[PDB]
Amino acid sequence: XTXPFXX
Amino acid sequence: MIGLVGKKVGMTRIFTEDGVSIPVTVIEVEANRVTQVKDLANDGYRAIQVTTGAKKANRVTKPEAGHFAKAGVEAGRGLWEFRLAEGEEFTVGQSISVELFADVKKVDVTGTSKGKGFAGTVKRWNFRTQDATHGNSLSHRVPGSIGQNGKVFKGKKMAGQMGNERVTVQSLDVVRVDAERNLLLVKGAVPGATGSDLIVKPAVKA
RNA sequence: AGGACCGAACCGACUAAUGUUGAAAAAUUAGCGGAUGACUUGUGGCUGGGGGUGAAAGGCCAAUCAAACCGGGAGAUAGCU
RNA sequence: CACAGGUGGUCAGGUAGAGAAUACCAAGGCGCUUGAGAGAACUCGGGUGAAGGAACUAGGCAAAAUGGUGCCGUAACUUC
RNA sequence: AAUUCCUUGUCGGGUAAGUUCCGACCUGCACGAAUGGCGUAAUGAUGGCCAGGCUGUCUCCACCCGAGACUCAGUGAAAUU
RNA sequence: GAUGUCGGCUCAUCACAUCCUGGGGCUGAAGUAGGUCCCAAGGGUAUGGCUGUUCGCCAUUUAAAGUGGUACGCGAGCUGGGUUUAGAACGUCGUGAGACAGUUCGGUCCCUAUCUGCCGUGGGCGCUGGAGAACUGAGGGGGGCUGCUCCUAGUACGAGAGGACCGGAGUGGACGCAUCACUGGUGUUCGGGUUGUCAUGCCAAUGGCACUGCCCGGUAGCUAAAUGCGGAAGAGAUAAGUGCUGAAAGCAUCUAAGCACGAAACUUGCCCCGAGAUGAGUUCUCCCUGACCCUUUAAGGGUCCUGAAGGAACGUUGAAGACGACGACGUUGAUAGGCCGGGUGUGUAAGCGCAGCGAUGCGUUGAGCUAACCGGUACUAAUGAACCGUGAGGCUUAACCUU
Numbered sequence: 001x002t003x004p005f006x007x
Numbered sequence: 008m009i010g011l012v013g014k015k016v017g018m019t020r021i022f023t024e025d026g027v028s029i030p031v032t033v034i035e036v037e038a039n040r041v042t043q044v045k046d047l048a049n050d051g052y053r054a055i056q057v058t059t060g061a062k063k064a065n066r067v068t069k070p071e072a073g074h075f076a077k078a079g080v081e082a083g084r085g086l087w088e089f090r091l092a093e094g095e096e097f098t099v100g101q102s103i104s105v106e107l108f109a110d111v112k113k114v115d116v117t118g119t120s121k122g123k124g125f126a127g128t129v130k131r132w133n134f135r136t137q138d139a140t141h142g143n144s145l146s147h148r149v150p151g152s153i154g155q156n157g158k159v160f161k162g163k164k165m166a167g168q169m170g171n172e173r174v175t176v177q178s179l180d181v182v183r184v185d186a187e188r189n190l191l192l193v194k195g196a197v198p199g200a201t202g203s204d205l206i207v208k209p210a211v212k213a
Numbered sequence: 214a215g216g217a218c219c220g221a222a223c224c225g226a227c228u229a230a231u232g233u234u235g236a237a238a239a240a241u242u243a244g245c246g247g248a249u250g251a252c253u254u255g256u257g258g259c260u261g262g263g264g265g266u267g268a269a270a271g272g273c274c275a276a277u278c279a280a281a282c283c284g285g286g287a288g289a290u291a292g293c294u
Numbered sequence: 295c296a297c298a299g300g301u302g303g304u305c306a307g308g309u310a311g312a313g314a315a316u317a318c319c320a321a322g323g324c325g326c327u328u329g330a331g332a333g334a335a336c337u338c339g340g341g342u343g344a345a346g347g348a349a350c351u352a353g354g355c356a357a358a359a360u361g362g363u364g365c366c367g368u369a370a371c372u373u374c
Numbered sequence: 375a376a377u378u379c380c381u382u383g384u385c386g387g388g389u390a391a392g393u394u395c396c397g398a399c400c401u402g403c404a405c406g407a408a409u410g411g412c413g414u415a416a417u418g419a420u421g422g423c424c425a426g427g428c429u430g431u432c433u434c435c436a437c438c439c440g441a442g443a444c445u446c447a448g449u450g451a452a453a454u455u
Numbered sequence: 456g457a458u459g460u461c462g463g464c465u466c467a468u469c470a471c472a473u474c475c476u477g478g479g480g481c482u483g484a485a486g487u488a489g490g491u492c493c494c495a496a497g498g499g500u501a502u503g504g505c506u507g508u509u510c511g512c513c514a515u516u517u518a519a520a521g522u523g524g525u526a527c528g529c530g531a532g533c534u535g536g537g538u539u540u541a542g543a544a545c546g547u548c549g550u551g552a553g554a555c556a557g558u559u560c561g562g563u564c565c566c567u568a569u570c571u572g573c574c575g576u577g578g579g580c581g582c583u584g585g586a587g588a589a590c591u592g593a594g595g596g597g598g599g600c601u602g603c604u605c606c607u608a609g610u611a612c613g614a615g616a617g618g619a620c621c622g623g624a625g626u627g628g629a630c631g632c633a634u635c636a637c638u639g640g641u642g643u644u645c646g647g648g649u650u651g652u653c654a655u656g657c658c659a660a661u662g663g664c665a666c667u668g669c670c671c672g673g674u675a676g677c678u679a680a681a682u683g684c685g686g687a688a689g690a691g692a693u694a695a696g697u698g699c700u701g702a703a704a705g706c707a708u709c710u711a712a713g714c715a716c717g718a719a720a721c722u723u724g725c726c727c728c729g730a731g732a733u734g735a736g737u738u739c740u741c742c743c744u745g746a747c748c749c750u751u752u753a754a755g756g757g758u759c760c761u762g763a764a765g766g767a768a769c770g771u772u773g774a775a776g777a778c779g780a781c782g783a784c785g786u787u788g789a790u791a792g793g794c795c796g797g798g799u800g801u802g803u804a805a806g807c808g809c810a811g812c813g814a815u816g817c818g819u820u821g822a823g824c825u826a827a828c829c830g831g832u833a834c835u836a837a838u839g840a841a842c843c844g845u846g847a848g849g850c851u852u853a854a855c856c857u858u
């Protein structure tokens with residue numbers, strides 16, 4: 001959700 | 008022409024009158040004795056098998072003894088071969104001295120390189136180390152990419168054994184020949200460590 | 214004198230690295246900030262879910278929050294897999 | 295979890311020190327419930343470095359450096 | 375311009391070279407006066423830029439001390455399929 | 456019911472529509488230097504400023520700073536500036552919530568590699584009696600870059616200015632291999648200085664701890680910045696291209712017959728691996744020359760005797776090494792350690808004495824200590840044995856013995 005997995 | 012087998016004693020410096028220092032590698036080329044002469048009728052090629060040094064009688068096996076007894080020569084620490092230049096002729100038991108290199112003026116030395124063991128890509132292939140900072144995570148001295156988006160080609164420069172292999176350095180200058188001491192001084196560094204065996208042959212490049 | 218200064222305890226959490234089936238379901242190490250105050254902390258008490266509280270971020274309300282959890286309506290409905 | 299975490303209060307030695315910092319010690323209590331050996335790549339945590347010295351890089355990230363007491367001395371600007 | 379699309383605007387300064395930065399010009403695509411305008415000493419783990427010093431950040435890595443990796447004995451997982 | 460992304464870093468690989476180097480044709484090619492086209496992919500092919508950038512501009516170099524493909528190569532390899540969440544403002548649109556390929560500050564990149572593949576390294580069996588060594592080289596990799604200066608020659612050329620091909624020599628850059636004699640780095644296993652503190656009863660002398668406590672030096676080893684070598688010449692067959700002779704076509708014509716030149720490409724030449732080259736090779740040497748039995752009688756089975764050459768294991772070990780492996784040695788012995796001597800490094804120990812109120816200084820003294828180095832030395836450990844491995848090595852055919 002946060003951009004790249006899992007930022 | 009044919010060469011000779013010797014031992015690496017070490018390196019030193021030779022001083023000239025004009026004020027020059029020559030890095031030399033001392034090589035002890037003792038009397039090399041022939042143990043077998045090969046021809047085209049029985050072997051298919053012309054060559055000689057020589058030995059040098061000495062060995063323990065209590066440690067030399069009977070198969071090797073019979074090979075030395077047939078030539079009427081004492082056992083040595085090994086056996087090497089050299090090809091003949093279509094005009095050379097030798098005989099079993101003939102002892103060759105370092106005087107053979109009295110007028111060659113250049114030789115190509117061959118030896119077993121020192122052993123580095125398991126080496127990396129920076130040491131073995133001079134790869135460029137990545138950034139030690141700026142975010143690098145466990146990838147400081149790693150190779151990086153090894154292919155594309157599906158196999159690693161053969162001969163890929165990777166880590167592995169480095170050294171302990173046959174290496175030959177070419178076009179070395181002969182600085183001095185002392186048959187009274189069974190020595191040979193060649194300008195420059197040769198492969199291998201002190202106490203290793205060296206194969207010395209005239210320079211083939213010429 | 215001081216929401217004053219440097220700086221331990223104490224309270225915080227700016228950077229980096231490590232760790233990321235971790236020692237740890239948010240920490241460790243090296244530094245960093247405040248450190249008589251709008252400070253911090255112990256014990257107990259009050260505010261209850263379209264409500265509370267909020268120096269406000271849609272933040273917190275028992276590792277869960279653009280409407281907590283438990284049970285029930287309930288085998289909700291699902292023209293979709 | 296026999297978990298590098300968290301948990302309020304009281305007692306507060308010696309040398310150096312401004313100090314409950316820090317270092318080494320006392321009383322006292324521990325060596326952290328797998329070890330032995332070898333001494334490769336690579337990783338982690340550190341030490342040093344020829345000449346050059348930010349050319350690195352998104353960016354001086356990180357690291358290095360500065361670091362105390364006393365005397366002298368101290369600019370622009372200023373709400374003095 | 376924390377606001378400028380055109381645009382790295384133009385001039386100057388700084389650099390051997392500066393799409394950033396500083397100072398002027400206004401041609402303000404699309405500033406503007408308490409959803410405040412222009413300045414402002416001081417403060418800031420704030421944002422951008424230039425210097426001195428400093429350094430393995432880099433040119434280009436080299437060696438060393440330790441914890442793992444490696445071997446032996448004991449105990450003995452995991453995602454996945 | 457998931458194929459993660461611009462650029463950068465690292466690592467690359469292929470193509471040729473070739474940037475440089477090489478070989479040629481035409482030229483409005485005098486020469487120098489260029490223009491265009493053909494052959495050619497062997498090798499080589501910038502650092503920096505600004506910007507997240509690729510790109511681009513600029514500065515300064517270079518023989519040249521090539522064009523493209525490889526998921527606009529490469530995030531189970533790194534990065535996260537950009538893109539691409541939640542926070543917060545400016546401008547702008549909207550009554551507003553909020554929004555904008557507009558801007559601005561800030562903002563978690565996980566995975567212990569099963570298979571394939573690749574880099575390295577071993578075990579097993581096989582190669583037809585077994586074993587110990589040296590080789591042949593089928594084949595496969597590595598390497599293949601280039602500038603400047605001088606001579607040739609200020610000659611050829613050219614009105615001058617200016618300025619060569621061919622050929623030769625020397626010296627460099629980049630890359631690569633090896634090496635540690637030199638110059639140096641490292642040297643927490645050497646020596647010394649020194650701060651605080653504790654202890655060894657105390658003085659003196661030492662030691663522990665404080666990043667090796669902080670520092671100055673420094674052996675061996677490793678090592679580069681250090682110093683030696685290397686790219687080739689040559690050969691064969693060729694590309695574009697140039698040709699000789701020569702007909703079809705009475706001439707002409709490089710070609711159809713025939714013949715000769717021709718490049719960093721190609722095949723060799725140099726370096727390395729290499730007979731698992733199951734097509735398993737060659738050569739030299741060494742070892743074993745028993746007695747029986749059973750039997751669906753054969754490349755048969757079993758027993759007693761025998762145990763070779765040689766190997767393995769064990770042990771001391773290595774400038775060999777992750778483990779295996781490889782190398783050396785094992786009392787008929789210098790393999791390791793220790794010991795002796797030397798060297799090296801540190802820099803004049805301790806104790807005593809002397810001068811000084813003392814801190815200190817001087818003499819004994821270039822003393823003492825001294826790791827991995829050098830040359831020696833059986834003091835210690837490397838034990839005698841045992842184990843594995845056998846007992847003459849198939850059938851057919853041919854030629855020889857008995858050409």
Ligand SMILES: CC1=C\[C@@H](O)C[C@@H](F)Cc2nc(co2)C(=O)N2CCC[C@@H]2C(=O)O[C@H]([C@H](C)COC(=O)Nc2cc3ccccc3cn2)[C@H](C)/C=C/C(=O)NC\C=C\1
Pocket residue numbers: 003457458459539
């Ligand atoms: C990796 C993956 C699945 C793989 O199996 C398969 C993938 F690899 C395939 C693929 N993906 C992409 C391209 O191809 C891709 O764009 N993304 C993968 C990483 C995140 C990013 C993404 O989606 O980011 C958007 C972001 C707003 C997109 O912004 C746009 O403006 N998108 C856009 C532009 C258009 C333009 C024209 C017409 C239509 C358009 C539609 N959309 C946000 C952050 C979403 C993130 C998310 O869901 N992450 C999960 C990851 C999934």
